[PDB]
């Protein structure tokens, strides 16, 4: 995406010297509201709500997790999951693009 | 029709009877004219 992003990715992995950019690679690296709930008014049809697309985004475990399931989760697996998705994502994206 | 069709604008109004008879000297003529109008209406409708 960005040149410095590519460098940070190639440096996260230790295979930074095994990459060589071409001319073109360098030249390209430098560049209504439908009522869903009813806590406040009269709810619209559930079909209408389904027709609309939901996007929370800001939360990590979505907008709802049942009590028993959350209470009986594993913390190590989710810590590793967040480390893979939130922090190490750029390095893996670069490894997907370059490094075959 | 069997009902008087309620409407939105005022259809009549009273004439005030607390004015001094000395100062206002044309209320009697207005009331005479109103009576004659009522009589004409009665005669036509009959």
């Amino acid at each position: 995406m960005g040149y410095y992003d590519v460098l940070a990715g190639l440096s996260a992995l230790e295979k930074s010297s095994q990459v060589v950019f071409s001319a073109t690679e360098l030249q390209q690296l430098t560049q209504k509201r439908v009522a869903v709930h009813g806590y406040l008014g009269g709810k619209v049809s559930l079909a209408d709500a389904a027709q609309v697309e939901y996007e929370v985004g800001h939360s990590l475990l979505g907008s709802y997790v049942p009590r028993q399931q959350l209470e009986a989760l594993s913390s190590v697996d989710f810590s590793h999951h967040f480390h893979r998705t939130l922090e190490c994502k750029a390095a893996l994206e670069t490894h997907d693009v370059f490094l075959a | 029709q069997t009902n008087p069709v309620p409407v939105t604008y005022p259809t009549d109004a009273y004439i005030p009877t607390y004015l001094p008879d000395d100062k206002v000297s044309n209320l009697a003529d207005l009331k005479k004219l109103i009576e004659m109008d009522s009589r004409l209406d009665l005669y036509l409708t009959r």
């Binding site: 509201r33 806590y39 406040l40 985004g57 800001h58 939360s59 990590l60 939130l86 | -």
Partner: protein, 139 residues
């Protein structure tokens, strides 16, 4: 300034305004929170704050600088390790329970407005409210 400062005319909207009663003939006033643009903007800000709060680490102890007097010996537990974690959790959960507070607030407001003419003296005692409440009870 020198002459009469009112100058009533036959408009009844300038006449009413010149004597103070200007908004007193409109149903409800004009506010800012009634437009979808400001609502979308506020929602964006709230979502951004919640994102930032959720991207915090769980192990978020705090060194309080008053732990000096508590001679911690690498085995004891500091009595103030969870003070920024508690504040972060409080703010996050309060930001996630916004609609619940809104619902309870609007329930309170509706149930206190519906009884204005029965609980507020200067509204209950006007001749017009009394006349209306009598007119309803005409057998």
């Amino acid at each position: 300034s020198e002459k009469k400062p009112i100058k009533i005319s036959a408009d009844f909207n300038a006449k009413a305004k010149s004597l103070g009663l200007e908004s007193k003939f409109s149903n409800a006033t004009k506010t800012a929170l009634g437009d979808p643009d400001t609502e979308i903007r506020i929602s964006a800000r709230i979502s951004n704050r919640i994102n930032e709060l959720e991207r915090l680490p769980a192990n978020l102890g705090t060194y309080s600088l008053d732990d000096c007097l508590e001679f911690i010996t690498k085995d004891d537990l500091s009595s103030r390790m969870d003070t920024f974690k508690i504040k972060a959790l409080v703010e996050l959960k309060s930001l996630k329970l916004l609609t619940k507070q809104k619902s309870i607030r609007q329930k309170l407001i509706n149930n206190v407005a519906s009884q204005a003419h029965h609980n507020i003296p200067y509204l209950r005692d006007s001749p017009f409210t009394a006349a209306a409440q009598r007119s309803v009870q005409i057998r």
